[PDB]
Design a protein around this ligand. Structure first.
Ligand SMILES: O=C(O)c1cccc(=S)n1O
Ligand SMILES: [Zn+2]
Ligand SMILES: [Zn+2]
Length: 230
């Protein structure tokens, strides 16, 4: 009903200062796969969570931001070294945008056929980002839940909203599978899922890479499906 099309992307306002960006890529056995990230206005700047699949699509995200918000993009954080999350890093860099990822994502990105972020996040033992490594993140609350979908997957809550972003760790409350497990940590996936849920106990809107936003039943149901792996 409320989704705004812009070229080949889709933008959905989730909250006063928060939009979901969605881009698509054909893959065998799936069709044209939606990948979601976030756009957050924080005062006079914009923050991005995840690229689109490609440079061109990512440049279109920046064009939408220019048209609809018309404020500088201060930074992007990208939530692991796969194409749906880091495929457009060159577009961000060309645009002069500072980029952040888990240290491990930056380490894996070259061999994944991806471009590393410019800055590395590190995490306390409890999984909260070390705040000095995430300067100017404003309302973004970055959390490493443990290895799951990938060894390097991270998650993002938004202060002052009921939104938490699971990226490709979380699936929707009616999801059939855990999707791509080629890089999954089969032993630990199950626990990582429930850690995300625990880190963001108040969030009623669970946003994720490959489904529309859902209730926390997404977390309960993802944890459940994961339990069957270990
Ligand atoms: O693991 C999934 O849920 C998944 C399914 C289809 C495509 C991609 S990129 N992912 O991560
Ligand atoms: Zn992935
Ligand atoms: Zn994915």
């Amino acid at each position: 009903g409320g989704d705004q099309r812009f070229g080949d992307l889709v933008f959905r306002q989730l909250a006063p200062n928060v939009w979901q960006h969605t881009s698509y890529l054909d893959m065998p056995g799936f069709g044209a796969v939606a990948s979601n990230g976030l756009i957050v206005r924080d005062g006079g700047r914009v923050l991005v969570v995840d690229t689109a699949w490609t440079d061109d699509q990512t440049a279109q995200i920046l064009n939408w931001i220019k048209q609809e918000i018309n404020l500088p993009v201060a930074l992007a954080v990208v939530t692991h070294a796969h194409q749906d999350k880091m495929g457009g890093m060159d577009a961000l860099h060309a645009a002069g945008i500072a980029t952040y990822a888990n240290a491990l994502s930056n380490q894996l990105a070259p061999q994944e056929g991806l471009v590393a972020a410019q800055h590395s996040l590190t995490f306390a033992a409890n999984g909260w980002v070390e705040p000095a490594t995430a300067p100017n993140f404003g309302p973004l609350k970055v959390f490493y839940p443990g290895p799951g979908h990938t060894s390097d997957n991270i998650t993002v809550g938004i202060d002052g909203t009921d939104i938490a972003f699971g990226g490709c760790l979380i699936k929707d409350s009616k999801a059939k599978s855990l999707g791509n497990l080629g890089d999954a940590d089969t032993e630990h996936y199950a626990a990582s899922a429930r850690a995300f849920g625990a880190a963001f106990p108040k969030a009623s809107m669970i946003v994720m890479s490959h489904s529309a936003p859902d209730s926390r039943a997404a977390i309960t149901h993802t944890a459940r499906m994961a339990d069957k792996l270990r």
